[PDB]
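Exercise (ungraded).
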Amino acid sequence: MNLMITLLTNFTLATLLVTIAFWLPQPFSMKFFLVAITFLLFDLEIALLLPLPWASQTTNLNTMLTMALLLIFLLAVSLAYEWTQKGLEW
Amino acid sequence: LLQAEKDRRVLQMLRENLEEEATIMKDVPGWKVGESVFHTTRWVTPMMGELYGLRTGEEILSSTYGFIWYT
Amino acid sequence: MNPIILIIILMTVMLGTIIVMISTHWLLIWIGFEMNMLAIIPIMMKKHNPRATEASTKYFLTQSTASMLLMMAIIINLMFSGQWTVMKLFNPMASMLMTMALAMKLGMAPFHFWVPEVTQGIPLSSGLILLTWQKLAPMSVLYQILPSINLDLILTLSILSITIGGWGGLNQTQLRKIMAYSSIAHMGWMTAVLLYNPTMTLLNLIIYIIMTSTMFTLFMANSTTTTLSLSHTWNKAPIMTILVLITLLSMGGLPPLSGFMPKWMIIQEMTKNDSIILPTLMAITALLNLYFYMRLTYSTALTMFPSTNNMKMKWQFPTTKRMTLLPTMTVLSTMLLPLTPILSILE
Amino acid sequence: MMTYIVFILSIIFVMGFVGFSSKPSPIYGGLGLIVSGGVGCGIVLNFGGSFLGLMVFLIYLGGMMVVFGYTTAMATEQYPSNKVVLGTFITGLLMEFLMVYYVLKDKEVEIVFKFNGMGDWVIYDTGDSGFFSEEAMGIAALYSYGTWLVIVTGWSLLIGVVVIMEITRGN
Amino acid sequence: NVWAKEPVLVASFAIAGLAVILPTLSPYTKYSLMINRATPYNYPVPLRDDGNMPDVPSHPQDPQGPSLEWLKRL
Amino acid sequence: MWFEVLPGIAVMGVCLFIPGMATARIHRFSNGGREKRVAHYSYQWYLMERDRRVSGVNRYYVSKGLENID
Amino acid sequence: PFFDVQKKLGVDLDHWMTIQSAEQPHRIPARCHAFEKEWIECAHGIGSIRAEKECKIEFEDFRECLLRQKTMKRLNAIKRQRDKLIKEGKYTPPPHHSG
Amino acid sequence: MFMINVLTLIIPILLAVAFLTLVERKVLGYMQFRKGPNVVGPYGLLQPIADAIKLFIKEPLRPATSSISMFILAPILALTLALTMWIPLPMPYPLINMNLGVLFMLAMSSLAVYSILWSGWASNSKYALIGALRAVAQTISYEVTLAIILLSVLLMNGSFTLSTLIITQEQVWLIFPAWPLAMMWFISTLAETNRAPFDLTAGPFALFFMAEYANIIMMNIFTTTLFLGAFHNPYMPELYTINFTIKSLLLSITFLWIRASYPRFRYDQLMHLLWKNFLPLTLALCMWHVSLPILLSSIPPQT
Amino acid sequence: PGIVELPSLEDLKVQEVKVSSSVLKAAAHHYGAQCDKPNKEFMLCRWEEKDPRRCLEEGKLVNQCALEFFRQIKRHCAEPFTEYWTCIDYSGLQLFRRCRKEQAQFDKCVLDKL
Amino acid sequence: MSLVYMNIMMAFTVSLTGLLMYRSHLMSSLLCLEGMMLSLFILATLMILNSHFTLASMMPIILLVFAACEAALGLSLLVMVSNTYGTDYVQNLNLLQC
C-alpha cells in the first residue's frame, strides 16, 4: 500500500491540477489492422521470451540455449514469412 | 540457530494459544481441547490462524502481510 | 491459398488432434482443442463468399466459448484435489461443466444450433474435415474421463440428440443440413454407450467416419446442393446411383448391410444391463432418421426426375474428377457385415 | 486501509466485470476491462505476485485492450443512457450487495459450497527461507524441463500468424 | 554478390550462423556448467554418519569432499 | 555565446540534482545514520524480522551488538 | 482413444509438469508434500476403485491439507465465540501480548 | 516522512519541465542564430513561469466533447503516469526498491499508448481520429523493439532489481559490450517520446505537454542509469548524484540536438524501416547475447 | 480426532541469543569453523524426523554453542570486531566485499592471537 | 476455503452471463470473453501461489498467452465481418437461416 499511497498522492494532485485549471477561467483499411495484430502476436512471443534472464542459472544450459534459439528462430521465421509474402507492403 | 529460535517460537504460540482456548471454550458441549482435525499422528505445519489467531489485527497484519507490501 | 499453406494447415490439424490423443496434461488437451480451432478456421472461407464468413464467425464464437468453459472445468478440478493427470475427476460440478463443454465441442442437442449453419455455407471439403476431426477430437477425452460422470448428463444429451437429429431432418433438401442432422443423431448414438462399454463407442466412431467419408466423396464426385442435381447425376452416370443407394441404405442401418453392425452391438451390450426401454426408444428413433435417407434415395436412383439438355453435352466428356479414395472406403463401409468379431480388434 | 483489502479489491473487481457485462458501447467496455485488469493485478500482487501480476499487465493492459480499442475505433461507429444496460448494472450491484451482506452478517454463503466467510490473512507462508521468490525460479524453468510445452506454444503462435494472414488475404 | 543486395540480412545470417556454431568449438562450456552446478539453493542436507565410508567428510575444513578451487583462481 | 545558456542548464541540473540527495538524506535520517535495509528475499526479511524482534524497541536499526551476550 | 507413445518412445517429456513432488529446479517442496507421497503410495498398484473405497482417510487428510476448510471452520467458531464473550465482558482478554 | 519523499519527488517535476522548455528554446536558438528569451528578466526563467500561468489563465476549449468524463479521464491518466513513473528509478537510493522495475517501465509506456488512443477517440471528428490512429500505430510499433533491446541488455546482468545494474556498471560502461543495441535503444526512445524526426502531423495542451516532457526526462534518466554512469561509494550520495545529473543533462541536450536538424520521415518509410531493419537486427543481437554468456563463462549472479 | 502433544514452557526457556542481524551475519564463517560441528546432529534430526517439538534438545544445544562462541569472541580479540560489523552494517544488504580490509584485520587478529 | 475464491467464481459467472447475453456489438462479447480469461488466470494463480505449487507454475502465463492469441483470431474475424459489411452488429447476420 506504500506505492498505493504514491499513486493516490499523484492521482489526487493531478485531479487538483485539472479541476483548478477548470474552475478558474470561467471508413477503415485492412492495412491499419494488420500492423496491430502483428504487434499483438509478436508481443505475445516477447512474453514467451522475456523470462529468459530469469532462467540462465540452472544445470541444463545447452538445452536452454537450444530452445531459446528455437524461440527466436520461430519468431524470425514468422517475421520473414510475413516479410516475403506481401504482409507489410504498400 | 534461526531454525531453533523459529521452532521454539511456534511451539510457544501453540502452547499459549491452546492454553487460551482451554480457558475460553468451557461452555460449548463436545470440544476436545486440542484435537487436530487431521487423523494421522504427525506434526502438520500450522496454518497462520493456529499461530496468529485472535491476536487482534496488528501483529497478524505486520506478520502475514509484511513482506508482501514492505517496499 | 497456397498448396504449401494447405499442407501446413493439414499438418497443424493433425498435430492438434494427435496432441489431444497423446497427452496426459490438461493444458495440453486445451491447447490441442484451441489449435484445432485455429487451424480449421481457414479451411472454411476457402472461397470468399460471405456465407462462409458468417459460418466461420458462428463457429468461432461457439468453439471459443466451449474451450473457455472447458478451462473453467479444469480450474475447478484444481480448486478441488489438484493434479494434472487425466483421470477420475473430483467434483460432480466440474464433470458437469466439462461434459457440457465437450457437448458444445462436438454436436449435441442443446448445442447443435451452429452445426447446420456452419455446414450450409461452406464447400464440401471443409465440411468433411470438420465433421471427421471435430467429431473425433472430444471422443478420446470422453473415453478418458468416463469414470467420474453423472450418467444423466450423457444419457440425456444422447437421447435428446438422437431425437433432435431425427425430427429436425424431415424438412431440409440442403444436403449439408441433411448430413449435419445425421451427424447429430449418430453422435447421440456414439455418446450413449460411453459408461457401459466404450469399445462400442470407438467402433461406432470408426464406422461413422468411414460412412461420412464415402457420402461426402460421392458428393464431391459431382457438385450438388439439392436432390434435383442428384437426379441429373442419375441421368449422366449410372454407377453413382447404385453407390448412393448402397451408402444411403448403410446410413439407414439395415441388417444385410454394414451400417447395422454399430446399432446391434450397442443394443447387445446395453441390454446386458437392466436397460431395455431405452434401447427400444433409441432404435425406434433409429427407424425415424431413415425416412429422409429413404426419400433421398427415392429422389436419386429409383424414381427419376425430368432432366435438362446440356447433359447431352456432358455425355461427350468422360468423368475427370479425382477421388481421394472412394471405392476402398465404400466396400470397407458396406460389405463389413461378416466381420463383426473385428469388434475386439479395438481394445 | 485495513486487513480486508484483498476482499475489497475483489469487490471492485466484480463491479468492473458487471460494469462491462452490462453491454455498453465497446470503448466503455474496454475501459471497464482495463479497470478490472488493474484491480486484478492489485489482488494478485496482494498475494505476491512478484512477477505474474506485473506480467499480465503488459499483455492485457499492454497489448490486448490496445487492439480492442483500436478495432472499436476502426470498425464500429456507435454514434449517438439506455434502460437495459443500466438496469442490468443495477441488478448486478444488487446481487453483489446481497451476497456480500450475507457474507458479512452471517457465517457462510453457499451456492453449492461452504465458503468460510472471513477475510484472508489465512492461509499464508509462516516466514520460510524463500530467498528466490518461488514464482521467479518456477518460471525460470521451462527451458530445462520445458521441452515440449514452449515448442508447441511457439508453434501455435506461428500457425496463428499464417492463419491471420490467410484470412486477411494470404498471401 | 548479395552483400550489395540486402546487406543487413546477410550480416544477420552471418552472426546467426556463428551463434549456432560457436558453442561447439568452445573451451569454456564445461566451466559454465560447473559454475552453474556448484551453486546451492537448498540446504546441503547431511546424512546418517557412516557405514565406515571413506567419503562425506566430518569437518567442513576437511578437503576429502568435492570442493571448488577454480573459482578463486579465475 | 553559450555563457548565456549555462545558467538555464545549470539551474535545471540543480533541479535534477536535488531529489536523490534529499531522499538519501531522509534515508539516513529515518534510521539514525543507518541505511534503510533493502528486502528482496524471504531470507533477508526473516532476518530483519528477528532483528527487529530481539531489539526490544521493535525497531530494526538499533542493531544491539555484543552487549546482550551473557 | 488415449495412446501411449509417451511411454513407448522412452521420452518422458510430459510427466514433470504433472504433480507436485517431482523434482523442482531448486530442491524445494510444496506445502503438502508428504501427504501427496503417502497418498500416491496408498493408491499406486490399485485399480482406481478400491482407491475410491480404501484410501479415503488419507485422501481426506490430503484434501484438508490442500484447502484447510474445516480447520478454518474451527478457527472461525473460536473467533465468533471470542467476539460474543468479549461482548459479554467476562475476562477482558489477556490472550493479547500480556496478562 | 514517506509523503515528504513523494512530494520531494513530484514537486521539482514542474520546475524541471518548465526549465526544460526554456532550455530547449534557448538551445534551438543557439543551434540557429538566435539569442533569447532574455527580455523577460535575466535569461528567462520567469518566461516559462509566465507562459505556464498564462495558459492556466487563458479560457479553455469549449465542449465540443463526447463523454465529458472520458475527455477529462484521458489527460488525468497521462499526467498520473508521468508522476508515477519516477518511483523505482535509482539515483543512488530509489524511492521503492522492487523485485522488478523494467517491466513496470514498459507497462506504463503502454498506458501512455492508452492515453494517446483515448484522447484521439474522445477528441473530435474523423480526420483527427485518423491522425491519432496513425500516431497510436507508430507508437505501438516500437514497444516490441525497446522491450526486446532492454531485455538483451539486462541479460548481461541477469536480475531486474536495477541496483544490481548500478553495481554491475562499476568496472566499464555498458556502452562498450553493447554499442549497437544501445544505439537502437536510443532511437526507440526518440520513438517513444514522439518527437522529430518522427511525425505527429487536443486539450488541455499544457497537460499533454507536461506528459511529453516528463516522458522525455524519464527516458533520459533511465538511459543514464541503464547504459553509462560511474560508481557509488556509500555515505556520500552527492558524488553519484552530481555525475548522474551531468551525464543525463548532456544526453538530453544531445537528444534535443539530434531533434534540431533532421526532417520528418515518411510514414510508410517509418514502418518499413522499423520492421525490415530493426527487427531482424534486434533478433540477431538477442540470439548473440543469449549464446555469448554461455560461451564466455559469465552468467550473472542472479541471487 | 487426535490431539497434538506440545512441549511445555519448561523446555521453552533457553537463553536466547538476542543479538542483532548484521553482527550475526558478519560472524558466520568462523562460527561455521569452530562451532557448528554438533548442530548437524540437529540438522539430521530435522531431516530424519520432520517434527520439531522433538529435536528441541539439540536446538538448545546449538543455542548454547552459539552463545559460547560469541562469549569466546567477546572476551578476547577483537574489540575492533565491533568496528568490522559496524563497517558492514549500514551498507544496504550486507555484501561481504564491502569492508574487505577490516575483514583482513579481523582475520589477522583471530589468526595471530587465537 | 480462502474466501476470495467465492468472489472470483461469482465474477466468473458475471463474465459468463456477460458473454452469453449481449445485445448489439460483437466486440463487447469478445471483451467479456477476455474478462472470463482474466478471471481464470487470477483464480488459478492465487490457487497455485497458496498451494506452493512451485513446479508447474506455468499455468497462469501459458493459459494467458494461448487464450490471448484466441482473442487475436477473434479480432481478425470481427475485422473481416466489419469489412464485408457496414457495421458489426449481431443483426445483419440473419442470412443463412437454420
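Further reading is listed at the end of the chapter. For now, observe: The radius of gyration of chain B is 14 Å. Residues 2-24 of chain B form the longest helix (23 residues).
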